[PDB]
Amino acid sequence: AQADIALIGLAVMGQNLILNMNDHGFVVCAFNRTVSKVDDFLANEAKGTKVLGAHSLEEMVSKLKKPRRIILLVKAGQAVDNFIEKLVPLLDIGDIIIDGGNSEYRDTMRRCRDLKDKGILFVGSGVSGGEDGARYGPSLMPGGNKEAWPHIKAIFQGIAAKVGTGEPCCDWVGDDGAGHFVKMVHNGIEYGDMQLICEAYHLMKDVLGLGHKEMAKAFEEWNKTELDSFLIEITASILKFQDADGKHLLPKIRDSAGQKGTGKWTAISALEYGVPVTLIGEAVFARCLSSLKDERIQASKKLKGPQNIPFEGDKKSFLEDIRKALYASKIISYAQGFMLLRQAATEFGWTLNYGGIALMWRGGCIIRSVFLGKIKDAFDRNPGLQNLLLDDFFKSAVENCQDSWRRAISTGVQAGIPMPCFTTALSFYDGYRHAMLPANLIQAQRDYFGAHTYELLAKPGQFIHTNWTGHGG
Amino acid sequence: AQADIALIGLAVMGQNLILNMNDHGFVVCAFNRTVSKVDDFLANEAKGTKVLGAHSLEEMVSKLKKPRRIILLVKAGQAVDNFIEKLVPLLDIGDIIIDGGNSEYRDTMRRCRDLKDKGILFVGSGVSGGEDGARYGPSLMPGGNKEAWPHIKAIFQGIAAKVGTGEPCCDWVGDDGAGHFVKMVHNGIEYGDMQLICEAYHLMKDVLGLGHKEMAKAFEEWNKTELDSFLIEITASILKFQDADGKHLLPKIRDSAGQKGTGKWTAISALEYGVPVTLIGEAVFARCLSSLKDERIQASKKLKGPQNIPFEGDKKSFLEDIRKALYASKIISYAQGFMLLRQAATEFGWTLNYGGIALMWRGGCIIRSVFLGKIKDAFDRNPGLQNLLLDDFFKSAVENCQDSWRRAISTGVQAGIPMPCFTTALSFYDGYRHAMLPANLIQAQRDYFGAHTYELLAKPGQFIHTNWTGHGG
Numbered sequence: 001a002q003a004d005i006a007l008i009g010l011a012v013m014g015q016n017l018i019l020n021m022n023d024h025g026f027v028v029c030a031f032n033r034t035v036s037k038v039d040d041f042l043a044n045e046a047k048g049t050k051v052l053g054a055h056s057l058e059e060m061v062s063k064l065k066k067p068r069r070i071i072l073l074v075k076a077g078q079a080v081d082n083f084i085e086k087l088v089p090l091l092d093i094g095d096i097i098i099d100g101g102n103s104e105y106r107d108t109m110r111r112c113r114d115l116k117d118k119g120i121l122f123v124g125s126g127v128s129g130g131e132d133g134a135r136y137g138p139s140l141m142p143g144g145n146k147e148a149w150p151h152i153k154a155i156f157q158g159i160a161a162k163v164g165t166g167e168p169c170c171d172w173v174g175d176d177g178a179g180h181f182v183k184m185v186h187n188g189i190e191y192g193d194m195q196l197i198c199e200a201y202h203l204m205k206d207v208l209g210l211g212h213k214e215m216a217k218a219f220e221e222w223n224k225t226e227l228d229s230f231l232i233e234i235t236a237s238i239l240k241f242q243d244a245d246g247k248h249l250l251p252k253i254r255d256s257a258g259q260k261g262t263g264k265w266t267a268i269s270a271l272e273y274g275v276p277v278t279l280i281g282e283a284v285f286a287r288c289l290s291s292l293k294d295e296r297i298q299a300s301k302k303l304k305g306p307q308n309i310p311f312e313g314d315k316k317s318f319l320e321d322i323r324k325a326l327y328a329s330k331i332i333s334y335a336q337g338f339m340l341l342r343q344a345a346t347e348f349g350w351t352l353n354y355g356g357i358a359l360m361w362r363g364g365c366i367i368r369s370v371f372l373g374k375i376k377d378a379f380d381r382n383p384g385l386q387n388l389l390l391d392d393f394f395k396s397a398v399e400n401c402q403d404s405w406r407r408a409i410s411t412g413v414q415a416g417i418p419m420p421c422f423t424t425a426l427s428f429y430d431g432y433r434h435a436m437l438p439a440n441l442i443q444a445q446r447d448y449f450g451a452h453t454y455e456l457l458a459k460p461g462q463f464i465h466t467n468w469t470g471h472g473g
Numbered sequence: 474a475q476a477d478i479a480l481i482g483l484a485v486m487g488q489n490l491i492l493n494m495n496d497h498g499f500v501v502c503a504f505n506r507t508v509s510k511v512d513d514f515l516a517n518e519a520k521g522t523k524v525l526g527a528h529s530l531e532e533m534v535s536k537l538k539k540p541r542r543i544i545l546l547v548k549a550g551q552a553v554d555n556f557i558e559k560l561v562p563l564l565d566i567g568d569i570i571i572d573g574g575n576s577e578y579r580d581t582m583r584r585c586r587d588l589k590d591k592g593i594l595f596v597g598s599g600v601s602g603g604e605d606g607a608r609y610g611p612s613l614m615p616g617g618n619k620e621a622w623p624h625i626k627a628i629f630q631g632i633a634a635k636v637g638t639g640e641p642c643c644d645w646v647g648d649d650g651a652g653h654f655v656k657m658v659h660n661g662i663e664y665g666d667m668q669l670i671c672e673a674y675h676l677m678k679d680v681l682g683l684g685h686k687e688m689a690k691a692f693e694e695w696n697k698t699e700l701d702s703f704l705i706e707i708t709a710s711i712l713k714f715q716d717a718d719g720k721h722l723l724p725k726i727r728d729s730a731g732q733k734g735t736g737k738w739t740a741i742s743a744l745e746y747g748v749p750v751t752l753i754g755e756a757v758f759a760r761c762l763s764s765l766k767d768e769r770i771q772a773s774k775k776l777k778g779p780q781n782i783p784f785e786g787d788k789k790s791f792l793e794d795i796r797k798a799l800y801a802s803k804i805i806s807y808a809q810g811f812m813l814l815r816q817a818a819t820e821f822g823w824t825l826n827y828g829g830i831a832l833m834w835r836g837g838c839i840i841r842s843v844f845l846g847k848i849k850d851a852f853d854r855n856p857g858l859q860n861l862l863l864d865d866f867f868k869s870a871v872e873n874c875q876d877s878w879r880r881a882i883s884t885g886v887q888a889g890i891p892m893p894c895f896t897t898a899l900s901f902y903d904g905y906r907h908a909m910l911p912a913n914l915i916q917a918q919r920d921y922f923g924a925h926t927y928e929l930l931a932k933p934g935q936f937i938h939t940n941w942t943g944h945g946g
């Protein structure tokens with residue numbers, strides 16, 4: 001007993017989190033599957049620090065203060081289970097295993113129940129921020145068995161990012177897989193914001209004819225308005241970036257976007273639980289589309305676009321329209337993501353604090369922006385808020401942006417610039433707005449061909465089947 | 474041994490299929506879980522027919538000619554397994570169980586492998602057409618263990634719907650769960666076409682100001698053009714339909730659309746296998762949206778739409794634009810659905826005959842239209858066709874529709890009419906068209922914040938990571 005916590009998994013994420021913990025006065029015992037890396041770390045990044053090294057699992061467990069707290073930061077799937085299996089004969093009742101990898105939420109609840117009745121307290125935490133986020137202040141989203149929380153709270157909230165009011169970007173999310181489900185939705189929303197930015201960029205490049213310097217200048221301005229965020233900031237950096245030959249690097253890199261599952265899982269969860277999370281849907285499919293790079297080369301040779309009509313209009317005004325279209329569409333994505341959280345809370349009986357979740361996304365994480373602060377405000381003044389768009393700030397923001405947004409979609413449509421996320425946000429906005437929607441025709445159709453029955457608009461509850469086929473003869 | 478086949482499950486679907494088989498000279502032995510329904514059927518719908526009744530499973534198996542063929546048309550899930558479990562001690566090696574319920578494809582391959590090494594030949598067939606489709610000619614999509622097929626071929630292709638060239642709308646789809654996967658995609662595409670029609674309807678009602686009589690008149694005209702289909706036909710019927718009080722029934726029924734999973738499974742499969750099947754995606758979410766009926770009433774009170782600008786333009790011309798927008802968007806949905814089939818064939822090693830599948834959707838099924846015939850042509854002249862849009866017919870059709878389609882989206886956008894499927898089809902069309910897409914910005918972003926690496930456009934294969942953070946200092 002010397003170390004406050006142990007971390008198994010010495011990739012750069014692990015190492016940075018150990019160093020961050022050590023910088024806050026926590027003695028960490030490091031371990032890795034390939035044990036050589038432990039000495040390597042101790043000689044190099046960890047030289048002259050309070051961290052201990054371990055060369056066996058049994059040794060690492062004896063270095064720990066009781067309750068033994070141990071973090072796992074290994075590749076999600078089987079490895080987590082393999083490590084869990086090995087640690088349980090070695091642990092006392094009341095000891096805490098913490099999985100920080102991007103595990104999917106259903107494995108986390110399985111593991112949590114199983115370990116709970118073996119007396120071992122489990123928590124799956126999402127970590128967001130990447131390498132130097134992890135190093136100097138990550139966003140941490142813990143969930144699992146709450147008996148664990150008071151024991152890890154000091155470490156977790158200490159290494160976590162801080163919001164200018166002194167609050168940590170880390171607090172207890174909920175039971176079982178809540179932290180990991182929230183982490184997944186975080187990534188979903190990240191995909192959406194990235195796709196939105198790409199569409200704004202495409203309108204500037206191809207409608208407006210902007211070179212990457214003016215285009216980066218436009219992004220820098222936007223990062224000083226309501227769009228102030230990490231992602232807007234670094235996009236301006238990326239556009240300005242010149243490679244070794246003097247020319248801009250971005251138009252040289254291949255347009256086939258990768259994915260590591262977390263974004264599609266959000267989309268699949270929304271489909272499974274019947275939540276219209278359309279923009280993340282479109283973002284995920286927009287990446288799949290770009291993967292089909294060879295087909296698109298061949299399609300560009302064959303398929304024809306619109307008549308090339310030059311843009312005649314004040315470019316500065318159009319640049320303003322793209323800014324507001326982007327912000328309006330961002331508002332719908334976030335409303336949809338927060339609808340998904342509301343539904344998972346209902347499905348799995350989690351009591352979630354949405355303003356808590358907003359505060360946890362305010363810093364540390366990739367999606368950080370002033371915008372999350374406005375969402376915490378929305379939930380602070382009404383905790384039971386049903387949808388983000390029903391809050392006056394968002395109501396007024398979308399209402400203000402409406403013109404520009406419709407004008408940017410119609411101009412993009414005219415010029416043939418693909419806007420999967422900008423268009424689906426307006427479709428959802430106009431869909432959500434309408435008290436009466438043409439889905440009654442779908443219900444009439446289903447009853448004509450598969451006798452599925454329908455409700456009358458006055459007294460839902462009764463279900464009718466009409467013999468549509470012939471009303472005489 | 475007297476009966477050629479047995480059918481367990483006497484709902485109206487089952488009864489109609491038994492009667493259809495009997496009308497084609499096949500002696501059927503009927504059975505049901507609640508055995509009373511068997512006598513009821515034999516006294517009523519089946520009086521004076523060649524069908525036999527059974528009052529036990531053991532009796533039903535002895536009535537059968539070898540190889541014992543038996544169809545199950547029970548509620549999908551556990552019931553299918555329960556019945557499978559009971560039948561196997563009673564069956565000889567080489568006997569055929571056929572599941573005709575809407576089972577999901579992964580259960581079908583499980584059951585097929587398991588039964589295969591117990592010597593029992595399994596096939597999961599999708600049935601499409603509904604009650605009187607089943608009665609006089611359904612669309613049947615069988616897949617499983619091919620040793621079964623020659624034994625059921627005569628029955629299946631005999632009761633099946635016939636295309637004017639004499640061909641049955643039924644042929645072997647492939648191994649394991651191919652028939653059930655195809656059935657699921659069929660339903661996905663059905664959802665899409667229903668949503669597309671709803672959007673056309675919404676533009677007529679709210680932009681153009683058409684009453685349901687002129688609106689039904691417009692649909693009837695469309696059913697005589699390229700849009701000739703079952704769904705366009707019955708929508709015209711539904712719009713004309715007047716209730717007992719003289720007034721039109723459709724505006725009275727509640728706009729909350731139901732779902733029985735088959736449409737969302739298509740969408741989830743596309744997400745899992747990375748196929749941009751966006752329109753079915755949007756159709757499924759557009760139903761989820763309509764379910765949120767109470768929220769939408771409350772949202773309509775709060776959220777504001779566009780400035781009400783009256784439509785000044787030739788309504789007849791705009792009506793033509795909606796027709797072509799619908800047909801163009803239909804083409805993209807079908808291209809996307811056929812991309813999903815192409816990918817599942819690659820994932821599970823099925824050799825699928827896409828023109829075969831088109832011929833099976835040409836009649837019997839809900840989505841039947843002249844249009845499927847054009848798709849069989851596309852695949853007949855080039856079996857290895859990579860995407861439907863690369864075929865000259867579709868190339869020219871979309872190229873012709875382009876103007877009207879862009880004009881209908883921009884006018885819908887102006888007036889605030891939600892078009893989730895019309896917009897996503899144009900987004901996909903313009904996305905697929907472009908050889909260079911802004912997904913390289915997404916790859917640059919992922920490398921800046923999570924060091925995911927990127928490829929250079931010249932020599933894919935090499936993966937670079939740039940220190941974006943500072944190129945000096």
Ligand SMILES: O=C(O)[C@H](O)[C@@H](O)[C@H](O)[C@H](O)COP(=O)(O)O
Pocket residue numbers: 102127128129130187190258259260261262263365366919923925
């Ligand atoms: O996003 C974060 O904050 C996390 O550090 C982590 O989630 C990482 O970025 C993954 O790689 C997912 O992103 P992709 O699915 O695009 O790879």
Ligand SMILES: O=C(O)[C@H](O)[C@@H](O)[C@H](O)[C@H](O)COP(=O)(O)O
Pocket residue numbers: 446450452575600601602603660663731732733734735736838839
């Ligand atoms: O569509 C058909 O041809 C089949 O007879 C069957 O699939 C039925 O219609 C289901 O109910 C699915 O439709 P929903 O998911 O909308 O209910």
